[PDB]
Amino acid sequence: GVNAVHWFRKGLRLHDNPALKECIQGADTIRCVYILDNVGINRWRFLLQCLEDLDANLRKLNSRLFVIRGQPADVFPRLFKEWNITKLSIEYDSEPFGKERDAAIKKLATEAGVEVIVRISHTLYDLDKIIELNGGQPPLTYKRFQTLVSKMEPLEMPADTITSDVIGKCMTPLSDDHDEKYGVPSLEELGFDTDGLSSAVWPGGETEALTRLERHLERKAMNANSLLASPTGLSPYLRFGCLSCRLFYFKLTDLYKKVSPPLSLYGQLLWREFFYTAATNNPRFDKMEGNPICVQIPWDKNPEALAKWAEGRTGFPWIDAIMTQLRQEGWIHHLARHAVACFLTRGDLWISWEEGMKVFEELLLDADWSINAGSWMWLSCSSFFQQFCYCPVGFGRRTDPNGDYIRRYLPVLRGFPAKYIYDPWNAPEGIQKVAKCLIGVNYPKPMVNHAEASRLNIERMKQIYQQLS
Numbered sequence: 401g402v403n404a405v406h407w408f409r410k411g412l413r414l415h416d417n418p419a420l421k422e423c424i425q426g427a428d429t430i431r432c433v434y435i436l437d438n439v440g441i442n443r444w445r446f447l448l449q450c451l452e453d454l455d456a457n458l459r460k461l462n463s464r465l466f467v468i469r470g471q472p473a474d475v476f477p478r479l480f481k482e483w484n485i486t487k488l489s490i491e492y493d494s495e496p497f498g499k500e501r502d503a504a505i506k507k508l509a510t511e512a513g514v515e516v517i518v519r520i521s522h523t524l525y526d527l528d529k530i531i532e533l534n535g536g537q538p539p540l541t542y543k544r545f546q547t548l549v550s551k552m553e554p555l556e557m558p559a560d561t562i563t564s565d566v567i568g569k570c571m572t573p574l575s576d577d578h579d580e581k582y583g584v585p586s587l588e589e590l591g592f593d594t595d596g597l598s599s600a601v602w603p604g605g606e607t608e609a610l611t612r613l614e615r616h617l618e619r620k621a622m623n624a625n626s627l628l629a630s631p632t633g634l635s636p637y638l639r640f641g642c643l644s645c646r647l648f649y650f651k652l653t654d655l656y657k658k659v660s661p662p663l664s665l666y667g668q669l670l671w672r673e674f675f676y677t678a679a680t681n682n683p684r685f686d687k688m689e690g691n692p693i694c695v696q697i698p699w700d701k702n703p704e705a706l707a708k709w710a711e712g713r714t715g716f717p718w719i720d721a722i723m724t725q726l727r728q729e730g731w732i733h734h735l736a737r738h739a740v741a742c743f744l745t746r747g748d749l750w751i752s753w754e755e756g757m758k759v760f761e762e763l764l765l766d767a768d769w770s771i772n773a774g775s776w777m778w779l780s781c782s783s784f785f786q787q788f789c790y791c792p793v794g795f796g797r798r799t800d801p802n803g804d805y806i807r808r809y810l811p812v813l814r815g816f817p818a819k820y821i822y823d824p825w826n827a828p829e830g831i832q833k834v835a836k837c838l839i840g841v842n843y844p845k846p847m848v849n850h851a852e853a854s855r856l857n858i859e860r861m862k863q864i865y866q867q868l869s
């Protein structure tokens with residue numbers, strides 16, 4: 401009869417999944433597949449927990465998740481024959497590399513005779529309609545984007561959650577060896593080293609996401625504490641699709657009327673849509689050269705300075721603590737991202753924003769390709785009509801004067817008083833000795849003179865924008 405596959409990539413959830421809902425209709429069998437292809441261990445652990453949660457939720461419906469390793473263009477032809485498939489569904493991917501992959505798979509599926517169901521559910525709106533309304537090009541200012549959104553039609557209701565009623569007569573063929581053939585692998589099974597690993601600060605999955613949403617909405621009814629990961633934080637769940645942006649939007653509206661909302665209510669989701677809209681028609685969005693919206697800047701090439709930044713060994717505790725929290729947990733505060741991005745690019749190291757993007761792509765759980773690239777251009781003054789220097793000592797000191805953020809992520813500095821915790825090289829030798837941390841030995845000296853470096857770099861950027869004008 402009619403055998404369907406729903407292909408999970410993003411949208412790792414059973415709620416608000418219109419592609420999966422439409423795939424199930426009229427189908428006699430359904431199989432949900434995830435296909436495993438610069439990704440760090442925290443990202444992999446989050447994804448694997450998403451799949452684990454997906455699998456457990458499908459088992460409640462007497463189904464399972466099918467995890468396959470391979471290239472989709474190799475794998476789907478085999479699957480189409482093995483399972484006699486005539487129906488394939490995906491959530492639409494607006495990002496240019498995902499667009500490219502999906503057009504190839506659609507071609508393969510058509511040749512095989514498989515119909516392809518594509519549904520928008522990872523963004524609030526159809527990005528093509530926003531671009532058409534703005535005249536064929538995405539807006540490069542948030543204000544114009546807000547003007548476009550406010551003209552759009554009201555958001556339709558989120559798709560019905562995949563339940564037993566929705567499934568109807570559809571079923572999943574099961575085998576007793578399913579885990580051996582198609583199980584969700586562990587990190588070690590992928591070859592990752594997990595010896596140092598601690599329990600995840602950000603456990604993946606739709607169940608965690610929906611639990612966090614309820615608690616977030618109840619609570620809603622920077623500062624030193626806000627630097628720490630929040631139990632009600634939602635951005636990794638949005639990036640992976642564990643939490644629908646449309647469901648979040650609808651819950652926010654509901655909360656507002658219980659307590660004509662302004663768009664700033666939806667600012668977290670709208671800012672995400674903005675960068676997705678900017679990226680979708682730009683295949684060079686993640687590059688400087690050949691990118692039509694990116695200012696050409698002669699960035700320095702310095703692998704050693706780049707490695708010090710990436711690994712949190714700059715000798716600036718504020719910067720190093722942030723980069724350490726990012727590496728250990730996969731999330732840092734919005735304003736912390738400003739601090740380290742400025743240090744790497746226009747502020748201190750004059751290193752290309754492309755290098756920062758690569759590091760965040762490995763480490764940052766909530767950093768979608770479109771948002772990561774757009775953000776690094778934004779904060780390096782390379783696009784979005786942006787023309788701007790954070791201080792790598794003062795910024796931390798003002799935000800967490802007692803320095804407990806530093807002591808949490810750089811324990812070698814714990815003995816230092818608050819007076820020197822953000823600039824330990826200024827501490828007298830006796831204080832360094834009773835803290836048992838000599839600067840330049842147990843913790844590195846500052847890699848750059850900030851005042852000299854920032855002053856020169858401000859001049860360089862000013863010359864760039866004088867050349868532009």
Ligand SMILES: O=C(Nc1ncnc2sc3c(c12)CCCC3)c1ccccc1Br
Pocket residue numbers: 668671672734737738741760764766767768771772773775776778779
């Ligand atoms: O987290 C980031 N970016 C945002 N993520 C969500 N919402 C928003 S609004 C907004 C930004 C943003 C960044 C630029 C200013 C306005 C980020 C920052 C630096 C490097 C990579 C990333 Br992935």
